[PDB]
Amino acid sequence: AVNVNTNVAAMTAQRYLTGATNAQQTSMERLSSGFKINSAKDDAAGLQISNRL
Amino acid sequence: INENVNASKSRIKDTDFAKETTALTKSQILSQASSSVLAQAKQAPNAALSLLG
Numbered sequence: 815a816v817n818v819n820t821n822v823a824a825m826t827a828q829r830y831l832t833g834a835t836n837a838q839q840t841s842m843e844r845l846s847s848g849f850k851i852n853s854a855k856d857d858a859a860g861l862q863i864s865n866r867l
Numbered sequence: 868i869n870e871n872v873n874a875s876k877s878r879i880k881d882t883d884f885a886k887e888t889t890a891l892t893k894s895q896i897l898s899q900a901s902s903s904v905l906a907q908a909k910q911a912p913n914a915a916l917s918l919l920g
Contacts, residue, residue: 838911846904848897 844850851861
């Protein structure tokens with residue numbers, strides 16, 4: 815059916831665009847800093863050992 | 868005592884050119900890596916124009 819109140823395609827494309835944008839932001843932070851461990855979210859365990867090293 | 872005092876002053880005060888030149892080159896590469904990431908980031912909001920907004 816064709817409806818104008820809602821657009822399922824619009825919601826899905828937006829969601830995958832926000833996920834892709836999040837991937838772009840986390841990646842670009844990695845190159846600029848040079849570290850793949852910039853916050854506990856990336857790796858909580860890996861951050862702890864790395865700081866100990 | 869003059870030579871041994873000077874050598875101690877060397878280990879503390881004088882710079883290690885081998886280690887410092889490496890630290891300078893590393894810093895430059897991160898300066899260029901951050902600059903490149905910045906340019907890629909400046910076009911992040913430009914995608915909003917593709918939304919015809």
